[PDB]
């Protein structure tokens, strides 16, 4: 008859989805773009030629210092200031709420018409393919399985085996 | 690629074809052939009673 489920912060999950899959937009075409044999072959002897490696897990700091700065300072001030204490405007804070941010403060505001509104027209682009990313990297992020799993010979683990026709990997297409 | 063309025999016709490899004819006429021998014949006609259950 139906679940009392809609989170109220059901509003948050979705701008958490603009995260996961717009971000995963920068994966589908850089990966499956490849360039097969551009001319041919990658040769990467450069910042990794001969200086005792380069990254790996000093990669993580240099990667996620300013991604720490990027992601960190994102949802914190997407909009919300005011931020204090006592009573509810319902999500699980909304202490900004009725207050935009500052009474008579500065230029807290982006743009005219007493709001944060970047006008009403732009439902066209970011509704379809951009949240399509959600429903695309859903099964095309679940091509993950098909692309590698089956562990190209080398490794069978707790040998049950249980079947044998032929291998499985990735390249595009398929037998049949 | 025995049978890229399951080609086989006569054409035609008289009898036990299935050579000669294959063989035989084993019980022949409508049988086997079925396969599909062919055809249907004023027989015989299978149905019961006979073959004269020739055994013995």
């Amino acid at each position: 008859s139906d679940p009392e489920s809609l989170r109220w912060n059901v509003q948050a999950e979705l701008v958490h989805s603009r995260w996961a899959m717009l971000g995963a937009a920068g994966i589908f075409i850089p990966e499956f773009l490849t360039k097969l044999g551009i001319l041919n072959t990658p040769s990467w002897y450069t910042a990794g030629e001969q200086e005792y490696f380069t990254d790996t897990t000093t990669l993580f700091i240099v990667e996620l210092v300013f991604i720490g700065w990027a992601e960190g300072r994102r949802w914190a001030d997407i909009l919300n200031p005011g931020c204090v204490n006592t009573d509810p405007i319902f999500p699980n804070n909304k202490l900004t709420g009725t207050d935009v941010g500052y009474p008579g403060g500065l230029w807290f505001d982006p743009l005219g018409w007493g709001s944060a509104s970047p006008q009403k027209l732009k439902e066209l682009r970011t509704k379809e393919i951009k949240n399509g990313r959600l429903a695309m990297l859903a099964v095309m992020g679940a091509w993950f399985q098909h692309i590698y799993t089956g562990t190209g010979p080398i490794d069978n683990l707790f040998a049950a085996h249980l079947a044998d026709p032929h291998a499985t990997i990735f390249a595009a297409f398929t037998p049949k | 690629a025995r049978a890229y063309t399951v080609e086989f025999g006569s054409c035609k016709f008289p009898e036990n074809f299935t050579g000669c490899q294959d063989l035989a004819k084993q019980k022949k006429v409508p049988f086997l052939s079925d396969d599909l021998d062919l055809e249907c014949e004023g027989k015989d006609k299978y149905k019961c009673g006979s073959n004269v259950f020739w055994k013995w």
């Binding site: 049949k176 | 019980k27 049988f31 396969d35 019961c48």
Partner: protein, 162 residues
Amino acid sequence: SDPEGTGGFIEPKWLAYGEIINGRYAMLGAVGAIAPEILGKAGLIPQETALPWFRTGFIYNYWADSYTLFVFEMALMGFAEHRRFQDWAKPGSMGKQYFLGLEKGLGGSGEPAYPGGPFFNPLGFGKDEKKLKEVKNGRLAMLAILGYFVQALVTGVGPYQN
């Protein structure tokens, strides 16, 4: 809103009337007798490892029309059975036509059940000549009949009758 599923004395019977109607032409074997010269038998597990039924039928089970891509069918075209079950909930616009071009009077039928758009070509009777659960009733009296005919044997013995 949440999808629906009304039980009421006897939906189970309208869709149960229907289930057998579909199975009455999925009866197949004697409704379309050209269908199986020998196709009623599926032909399981007769590897070039091994064996079929047992003494069978044996003069696999068969030559074959094989394969895989068997689930994807019954699923994907089952991904249609529940569409002529939604689309024609109605508000019609199915004929999206084509943006431009006034030349598209061309119709096809309408909603069809039977000789088509309508019935059609009015004009009829000379010769063909001389209630619709009966168009049901008799084909379970065709369905459940092959049912025992799969195992239709006494084997050790045979027709006592005879």
